[PDB]
Design an enzyme around this catalytic site. Structure first.
Site, PDB file in Angstrom:
ATOM      1  N   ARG A  25       2.224 -42.836  37.047  1.00  0.00           N
ATOM      2  CA  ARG A  25       1.432 -43.523  36.055  1.00  0.00           C
ATOM      3  C   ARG A  25       0.926 -42.497  35.051  1.00  0.00           C
ATOM      4  O   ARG A  25       0.758 -41.321  35.384  1.00  0.00           O
ATOM      5  CB  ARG A  25       0.267 -44.270  36.745  1.00  0.00           C
ATOM      6  CG  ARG A  25      -0.689 -43.376  37.531  1.00  0.00           C
ATOM      7  CD  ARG A  25      -1.236 -44.059  38.770  1.00  0.00           C
ATOM      8  NE  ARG A  25      -2.151 -43.183  39.505  1.00  0.00           N
ATOM      9  CZ  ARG A  25      -1.777 -42.300  40.428  1.00  0.00           C
ATOM     10  NH1 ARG A  25      -0.492 -42.158  40.739  1.00  0.00           N
ATOM     11  NH2 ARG A  25      -2.681 -41.548  41.042  1.00  0.00           N
ATOM     12  N   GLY A  26       0.749 -42.945  33.827  1.00  0.00           N
ATOM     13  CA  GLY A  26       0.190 -42.151  32.747  1.00  0.00           C
ATOM     14  C   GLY A  26      -0.963 -42.929  32.148  1.00  0.00           C
ATOM     15  O   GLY A  26      -1.342 -43.972  32.693  1.00  0.00           O
ATOM     16  N   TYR A  60      -0.962 -44.489  29.139  1.00  0.00           N
ATOM     17  CA  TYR A  60      -0.391 -45.647  28.461  1.00  0.00           C
ATOM     18  C   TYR A  60       0.709 -46.345  29.283  1.00  0.00           C
ATOM     19  O   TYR A  60       1.363 -47.249  28.754  1.00  0.00           O
ATOM     20  CB  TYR A  60       0.210 -45.213  27.104  1.00  0.00           C
ATOM     21  CG  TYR A  60      -0.757 -44.607  26.108  1.00  0.00           C
ATOM     22  CD1 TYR A  60      -1.017 -43.237  26.102  1.00  0.00           C
ATOM     23  CD2 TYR A  60      -1.318 -45.380  25.095  1.00  0.00           C
ATOM     24  CE1 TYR A  60      -1.863 -42.664  25.152  1.00  0.00           C
ATOM     25  CE2 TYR A  60      -2.175 -44.820  24.145  1.00  0.00           C
ATOM     26  CZ  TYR A  60      -2.445 -43.462  24.176  1.00  0.00           C
ATOM     27  OH  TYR A  60      -3.298 -42.914  23.241  1.00  0.00           O
ATOM     28  N   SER A  61       0.967 -45.919  30.533  1.00  0.00           N
ATOM     29  CA  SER A  61       2.085 -46.555  31.252  1.00  0.00           C
ATOM     30  C   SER A  61       2.096 -46.412  32.758  1.00  0.00           C
ATOM     31  O   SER A  61       1.331 -45.634  33.350  1.00  0.00           O
ATOM     32  CB  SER A  61       3.415 -46.015  30.720  1.00  0.00           C
ATOM     33  OG  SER A  61       3.588 -44.672  31.154  1.00  0.00           O
ATOM     34  N   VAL A  82       5.221 -46.096  35.838  1.00  0.00           N
ATOM     35  CA  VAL A  82       6.645 -45.809  36.028  1.00  0.00           C
ATOM     36  C   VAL A  82       7.109 -46.195  37.401  1.00  0.00           C
ATOM     37  O   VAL A  82       6.427 -45.944  38.390  1.00  0.00           O
ATOM     38  CB  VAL A  82       6.950 -44.321  35.674  1.00  0.00           C
ATOM     39  CG1 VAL A  82       8.417 -43.961  35.870  1.00  0.00           C
ATOM     40  CG2 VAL A  82       6.521 -44.005  34.248  1.00  0.00           C
ATOM     41  N   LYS A  85       9.690 -47.745  32.579  1.00  0.00           N
ATOM     42  CA  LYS A  85       8.346 -47.364  32.127  1.00  0.00           C
ATOM     43  C   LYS A  85       7.718 -48.580  31.480  1.00  0.00           C
ATOM     44  O   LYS A  85       8.145 -48.986  30.404  1.00  0.00           O
ATOM     45  CB  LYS A  85       8.381 -46.150  31.181  1.00  0.00           C
ATOM     46  CG  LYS A  85       6.985 -45.773  30.702  1.00  0.00           C
ATOM     47  CD  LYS A  85       6.895 -44.360  30.167  1.00  0.00           C
ATOM     48  CE  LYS A  85       7.414 -44.237  28.765  1.00  0.00           C
ATOM     49  NZ  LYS A  85       7.111 -42.894  28.229  1.00  0.00           N
ATOM     50  N   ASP A  89       5.200 -32.271  24.355  1.00  0.00           N
ATOM     51  CA  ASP A  89       4.703 -32.351  25.739  1.00  0.00           C
ATOM     52  C   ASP A  89       5.664 -31.640  26.715  1.00  0.00           C
ATOM     53  O   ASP A  89       5.935 -32.125  27.823  1.00  0.00           O
ATOM     54  CB  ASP A  89       4.429 -33.821  26.161  1.00  0.00           C
ATOM     55  CG  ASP A  89       3.502 -33.941  27.364  1.00  0.00           C
ATOM     56  OD1 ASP A  89       2.816 -32.950  27.689  1.00  0.00           O
ATOM     57  OD2 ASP A  89       3.476 -35.023  27.985  1.00  0.00           O
TER      58      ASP A  89
HETATM   59  C1  LIG Z   1       9.309 -42.200  32.325  1.00  0.00           C
HETATM   60  C2  LIG Z   1       8.450 -41.289  31.493  1.00  0.00           C
HETATM   61  O1  LIG Z   1       8.582 -41.219  30.279  1.00  0.00           O
HETATM   62  N1  LIG Z   1       7.425 -40.687  32.156  1.00  0.00           N
HETATM   63  C3  LIG Z   1       7.145 -40.513  33.540  1.00  0.00           C
HETATM   64  C4  LIG Z   1       8.156 -40.337  34.482  1.00  0.00           C
HETATM   65  C5  LIG Z   1       7.847 -40.101  35.814  1.00  0.00           C
HETATM   66  N2  LIG Z   1       8.854 -39.887  36.777  1.00  0.00           N
HETATM   67  C6  LIG Z   1      10.235 -39.937  36.704  1.00  0.00           C
HETATM   68  C7  LIG Z   1      10.923 -39.583  37.863  1.00  0.00           C
HETATM   69  C8  LIG Z   1      12.318 -39.600  37.899  1.00  0.00           C
HETATM   70  N3  LIG Z   1      13.107 -39.271  39.000  1.00  0.00           N
HETATM   71  C9  LIG Z   1      12.572 -38.855  40.293  1.00  0.00           C
HETATM   72  C10 LIG Z   1      12.098 -39.886  41.231  1.00  0.00           C
HETATM   73  C11 LIG Z   1      13.357 -39.163  41.501  1.00  0.00           C
HETATM   74  N4  LIG Z   1      12.938 -39.816  36.649  1.00  0.00           N
HETATM   75  N5  LIG Z   1      14.266 -39.792  36.369  1.00  0.00           N
HETATM   76  C12 LIG Z   1      14.352 -40.092  35.060  1.00  0.00           C
HETATM   77  C13 LIG Z   1      13.101 -40.311  34.469  1.00  0.00           C
HETATM   78  C14 LIG Z   1      12.831 -40.653  33.101  1.00  0.00           C
HETATM   79  N6  LIG Z   1      12.706 -40.909  31.992  1.00  0.00           N
HETATM   80  C15 LIG Z   1      12.187 -40.114  35.515  1.00  0.00           C
HETATM   81  N7  LIG Z   1      10.848 -40.192  35.535  1.00  0.00           N
HETATM   82  C16 LIG Z   1       6.517 -40.058  36.215  1.00  0.00           C
HETATM   83  C17 LIG Z   1       5.503 -40.209  35.288  1.00  0.00           C
HETATM   84  C18 LIG Z   1       5.804 -40.472  33.952  1.00  0.00           C
HETATM   85  N8  LIG Z   1       4.718 -40.595  32.970  1.00  0.00           N
HETATM   86  C19 LIG Z   1       4.490 -41.905  32.363  1.00  0.00           C
HETATM   87  C20 LIG Z   1       3.473 -39.819  33.324  1.00  0.00           C
HETATM   88  C21 LIG Z   1       2.695 -39.302  32.068  1.00  0.00           C
HETATM   89  N9  LIG Z   1       3.482 -38.606  31.039  1.00  0.00           N
HETATM   90  C22 LIG Z   1       2.767 -38.595  29.764  1.00  0.00           C
HETATM   91  C23 LIG Z   1       3.787 -37.237  31.444  1.00  0.00           C
HETATM   92 CL   LIG Z   2       1.784 -42.586  29.796  1.00  0.00          CL
END
Ligand SMILES: CC(=O)Nc1cc(Nc2cc(NC3CC3)n3ncc(C#N)c3n2)ccc1N(C)CCN(C)C
Ligand SMILES: [Cl-]
Ligand SMILES: [Cl-]
Length: 324
Positions: A45-46, A48-49, A51, A66, A152
């Protein structure tokens, strides 16, 4: 008033592209089908979102969803992701979906079988770090060449499926289009990866912010110290940098841009000599350090954003000879 600044590379990428390229507010979204995805587990979680790991039910492929909790911020991320799609090591935006009744949108990304960097970074070899650093650089030169600053860059935003030597620079939610002379929000990046420009509130920054952040990552990897600059807040973050890079070059930087430092900074910054990078080299991390790693790091971690290597100059560094 502060001295203006412009990017020394890709200054006018958005200037010479058609309006629809950077004008994300006009972009009309064509929505995919929400019913194609089954949520499996919460991944994070962030602000604004939220996941989730999900499954695309039409092809049994793993995806990352997301779910977005501002309309302007949503269109910006989508436009950036679409503009960058296909780019080397840029996360693929596979779909954009919405609850057809509630209107709550969600972005669907390709899945990366990531190993948490707090576990992975300890097992990486000298060659591994060079390889992955070169892969992040491909993504950064690409997004910068396309007029976009990530804003970021940090290990949590770098997905690495080590088994497949697969890397993706993710979460473009803070990313922004570069326009010369634009005053940007300094409240971007994670504290440990914030460039001195952000910490001194110098708003006329550019792509070079990502190079500082990358420098922080390199230092954390070759020295096995995560994060490398560990401040307790934004002010103390600049103190941590000053204790390594020294105060003389900091005050030269502030002086060059006629930056008015916050009254808080004066007493806390104190006076510190510039340290030799060698100081951070010890028995356990020495196998990841070489004269080329130190010279490369030294050219990334510069107060003056205009003096840091560009991603293309970084890719040319001898540190990457064995990789190229
Ligand atoms: C999706 C995205 O923009 N942010 C995001 C992704 C994650 N985690 C993951 C984890 C995985 N794989 C692992 C489980 C095996 N993957 N594989 C691809 C992507 C993508 N895109 C992705 N994202 C956790 C927190 C966030 N955010 C919202 C936290 C806050 N931000 C501002 C930093
Ligand atoms: Cl976020
Ligand atoms: Cl660049």
């Amino acid at each position: 008033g502060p001295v203006p600044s412009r990017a020394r590379v890709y200054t006018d990428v958005n200037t010479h592209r058609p309006r629809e390229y950077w004008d994300y507010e006009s972009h009309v979204v064509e929505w995919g089908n929400q019913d194609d995805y089954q949520l499996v587990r919460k991944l994070g979680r962030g602000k604004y979102s939220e996941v989730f790991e999900a499954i695309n039910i039409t092809n049994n492929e793993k995806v990352v969803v997301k779910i977005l909790k501002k309309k302007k911020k949503i269109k910006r991320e989508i436009k950036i992701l679409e503009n960058l799609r296909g780019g080397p090591n840029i996360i693929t935006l596979a779909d954009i979906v919405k609850d057809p009744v509630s209107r709550t949108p969600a972005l669907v990304f390709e899945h990366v079988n990531n190993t948490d960097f707090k576990q992975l970074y300890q097992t990486l070899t000298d060659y591994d770090i060079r390889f992955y650093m070169y892969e992040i650089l491909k993504a950064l030169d690409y997004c910068h060449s396309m007029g976009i600053m990530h804003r970021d860059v940090k290990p949590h935003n770098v997905m690495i499926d080590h088994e497949h030597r697969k890397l993706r620079l993710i979460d473009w939610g803070l990313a922004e289009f570069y326009h010369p002379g634009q005053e940007y929000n300094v409240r971007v990046a994670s504290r440990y990866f914030k460039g001195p420009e952000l910490l001194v509130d110098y708003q006329m920054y550019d792509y070079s912010l990502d190079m500082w952040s990358l420098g922080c990552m390199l230092a954390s990897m070759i020295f096995r110290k995560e994060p490398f600059f560990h401040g307790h807040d934004n002010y103390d973050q600049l103190v941590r940098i000053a204790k390594v890079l020294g105060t003389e070059d900091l005050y030269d930087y502030i002086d060059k841009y006629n930056i008015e430092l916050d009254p808080r900074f004066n007493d806390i910054l104190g006076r510190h000599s510039r340290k030799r990078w060698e100081r951070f080299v010890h028995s356990e991390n020495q196998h990841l350090v070489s004269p080329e790693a130190l010279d490369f790091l030294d050219k990334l971690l510069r107060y003056d954003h205009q003096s840091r290597l560009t991603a293309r100059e970084a890719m040319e560094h001898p540190y990457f000879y064995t990789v190229v």
